[PDB]
Amino acid sequence: EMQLTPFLILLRKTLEQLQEKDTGNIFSEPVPLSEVPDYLDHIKKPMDFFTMKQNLEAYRYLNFDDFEEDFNLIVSNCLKYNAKDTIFYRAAVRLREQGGAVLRQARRQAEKM
Ligand SMILES: CC[C@@H](C)Nc1nc2ccccc2n2c(C)nnc12
């Protein structure tokens, strides 16, 4: 029960904060299926920050849970696809931790709306 514009402004800011936590930009764009040809054999729904931005501006995120669900896919896909002893796997663990704090704060501000 809130206004659409301030909510989208908040998701835009939150998405920028999450992208800032991904310092290697390894989640900024879709996993290049031509460089990882078996990726879609394992990953039911790829997700990345660029796609999240397009979804945001297409009005696909009208509540905080749908935004956070796609962030969680970025993390879970990476944990699933990559072995534990890799930089990619540990980067998804770090993003889960650092991103989770960004999301809790942003969700509090959405609840103020
Ligand atoms: C051996 C498969 C590894 C290299 N997987 C990934 N490669 C990526 C390459 C470019 C951008 C993202 C990539 N990625 C992500 C995200 N999760 N796993 C991989």
Curated annotation (Swiss-Prot):
Superkingdom as given in the UniProt entry: Eukaryota
Bromo domain boundaries: 2-106
Post-translational modifications reported in the UniProt record: Acetylated by KAT6A.
Subcellular location as annotated: Nucleus; Chromosome; Cytoplasm
Tissues in which the protein is found: High levels in testis.
Disease: Intellectual developmental disorder with dysmorphic facies and ptosis: An autosomal dominant neurodevelopmental disorder characterized by delayed psychomotor development, intellectual disability, delayed language, and facial dysmorphisms, most notably ptosis. Additional features may include poor growth, hypotonia, and seizures.
Role of this protein: Scaffold subunit of various histone acetyltransferase (HAT) complexes, such as the MOZ/MORF and HBO1 complexes, which have a histone H3 acetyltransferase activity. Plays a key role in HBO1 complex by directing KAT7/HBO1 specificity towards histone H3 'Lys-14' acetylation (H3K14ac). Some HAT complexes preferentially mediate histone H3 'Lys-23' (H3K23ac) acetylation. Positively regulates the transcription of RUNX1 and RUNX2.
Subunit structure comment from the entry: Component of some HBO1 complex composed of KAT7/HBO1, MEAF6, ING5, and BRPF1. Component of the MOZ/MORF complex composed at least of ING5, KAT6A, KAT6B, MEAF6 and one of BRPF1, BRD1/BRPF2 and BRPF3. Interacts (via PHD-type zinc finger domains) with unmethylated histone H3 at 'Lys-4' (H3K4me0). Interacts with trimethylated 'Lys-36' of histone H3 (H3K36me3). Interacts with ING5; interaction directs BRPF1 to H4K4me3-enriched chromatin at the 5' of active genes. Interacts with KAT7.
Record's protein name: Peregrin
Record organism: Homo sapiens
Lineage per the UniProt record: Eukaryota, Metazoa, Chordata, Craniata, Vertebrata
Gene name as annotated: BRPF1
